[PDB]
């Protein structure tokens, strides 16, 4: 869906709530970028992000790492509510929260490497839910 100032505001709010959210992107259900913060760019990694969000596990090993803007992340948590990636050399973390739950949109947060992604999950998950109907 198109970007909106209603979406802008929810992101403004998240970024002030969660100090350690150092970057945001929103993927719509069609897998297109709705918006992202000016301090990063996920555009060239969207194919692999979408493959990951659409994945259906077979008990065959699925996707266990993903790269965004040259940083490779190990997937350490993978549920319908939240997926956590963490770079093995200290270059940061990502939290991907599907919108709706288990669905193909997502709120993605880049997390300060000095912080822990465990601490941001609650708010990023709530904020993914706020976006559900917007899109």
């Amino acid at each position: 869906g198109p970007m909106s100032e209603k979406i802008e505001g929810i992101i403004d709010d998240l970024l002030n709530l969660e100090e350690n959210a150092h970057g945001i992107a929103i993927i719509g259900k069609d897998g297109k970028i709705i918006t992202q913060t000016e301090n990063w760019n996920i555009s060239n990694d969207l194919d692999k992000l979408n493959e990951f969000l659409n994945e259906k596990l077979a008990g065959k090993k699925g996707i266990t790492s993903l790269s965004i803007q040259g940083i490779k992340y190990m997937i350490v948590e993978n549920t319908e509510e939240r997926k956590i990636g963490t770079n093995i050399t200290g270059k940061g973390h990502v939290v991907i929260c599907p919108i709706p739950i288990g669905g193909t949109g997502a709120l993605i947060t880049y997390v300060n490497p000095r912080a822990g992604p465990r601490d941001v999950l609650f708010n990023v998950q709530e904020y993914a839910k706020k976006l559900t109907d917007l899109i």
Binding site: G59, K61, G62, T64, S65, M74, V76, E77
Partner: protein
């Protein structure tokens, strides 16, 4: 001040005080109720007037009313505390159902009125007791065996393997194979005698077929054991055929791969970029990992499975019977953990589901 650490297993409860090196109390996870409640050693003592049950089955709490009696006994009779005065760290199995972990949290705050609590995964705690946050644990107790690969404290997605073959099953098999030798071991009380035999005299063969040959062609492997009625028995190849079952679960008619292969399969569910750390940090945890020879056997089997140049290390700490508890003591005593506890306040606001937010 001073947190409590309770590690609830299928066979044994380990309980104590955070910052101690060892559990204060270790006692059987049994509850007895009059024929037509008691807990632990007292329940066993009165077995002739009680019906005994295990409330935890294969690591998973299945009888909640009995499990409540276990916790009450732990706090009042074993540790001698008032639970409302101490943060309480509990433990759980890998893959414990959402509902189970909520119900634990509900009971601790509503029935025991604890001021704070936390639930940690058993293998994560064992790993941490060895001074690691990355590695693959083989955690094998009385009721369940798991393979748990862990990276920076996270149990890895879809890589945990659970096997319902552990120490109790091994005791039962040793009863059966001693019965094939000419002795008779059938009753519950006979099962306890056979558990003691297993603990004292069993071991894992480095090469099982080679060991079978040495048994059959000489008595150099035979040992003697005096029963409580005075009879002295002789045990030979049963000493190593009993724990061989971990490697060949077919011995008890299970279709599963052995613990060596389930280790490998677990590692193979993990990302390429972390497997070398798993192979290099294979920690063994739990009473069933106590058999002499087990680490060297596991080293051999994993080397046969793994890529030919892979560096492998099996770590089998001398204290691994209680490494889950010990990792919990260390963790709960840390200044930096003190913000991790679920508070009563947090519970009052969010209810039982607060556990999924906080214990992760």
């Amino acid at each position: 001040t001073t947190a409590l650490v309770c590690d609830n297993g299928s066979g044994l409860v380990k309980a104590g005080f955070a910052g101690d090196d060892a559990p204060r109390a270790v006692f059987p996870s049994i509850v007895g109720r009059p024929r037509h409640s008691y807990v632990g050693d007292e329940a066993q003592s009165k077995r002739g007037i009680l019906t005994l049950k295990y409330p935890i089955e294969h690591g998973i709490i299945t009888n909640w009313d009995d499990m409540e009696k276990i916790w009450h006994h732990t706090f009042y009779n074993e540790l001698r505390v008032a639970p409302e005065e101490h943060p309480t760290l509990l433990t759980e199995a890998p893959l414990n159902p959402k509902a189970n972990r909520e119900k634990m949290t509900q009971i601790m705050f509503e029935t025991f009125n604890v001021p704070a609590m936390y639930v940690a995964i058993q293998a994560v705690l064992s790993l941490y007791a060895s001074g690691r946050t990355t590695g693959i644990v083989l955690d094998s107790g009385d009721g369940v065996t798991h393979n748990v690969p862990i990276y920076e404290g996270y149990a890895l997605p879809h890589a945990i393997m659970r096997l319902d073959l552990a120490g109790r099953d091994l005791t039962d098999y040793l009863m059966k194979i001693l019965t094939e030798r000419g002795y008779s071991f059938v009753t519950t009380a006979e099962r306890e005698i056979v558990r003691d035999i297993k603990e004292k005299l069993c071991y894992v063969a480095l090469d099982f077929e080679n060991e079978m040959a040495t048994a059959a062609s000489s008595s150099s492997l035979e040992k003697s054991y005096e029963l409580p009625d005075g009879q002295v028995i002789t045990i030979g190849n049963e000493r190593f055929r009993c724990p061989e079952t971990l490697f060949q679960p077919s011995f008890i008619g299970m279709e599963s791969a052995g613990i060596h292969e389930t280790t490998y399969n677990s590692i193979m569910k993990c990302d390429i970029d972390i497997r070398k750390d798993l192979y290099a940090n294979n920690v063994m945890s739990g009473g069933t990992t106590m058999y002499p020879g087990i680490a060297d056997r596991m080293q051999k089997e994993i080397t046969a499975l793994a890529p030919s140049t892979m560096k492998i290390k099996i770590i089998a700490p001398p204290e691994r019977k209680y490494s889950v508890w010990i990792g919990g003591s260390i963790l709960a005593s840390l200044s930096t953990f003190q913000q991790m506890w679920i508070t009563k306040q947090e519970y009052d606001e969010a209810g039982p589901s607060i556990v999924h937010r906080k214990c992760f």
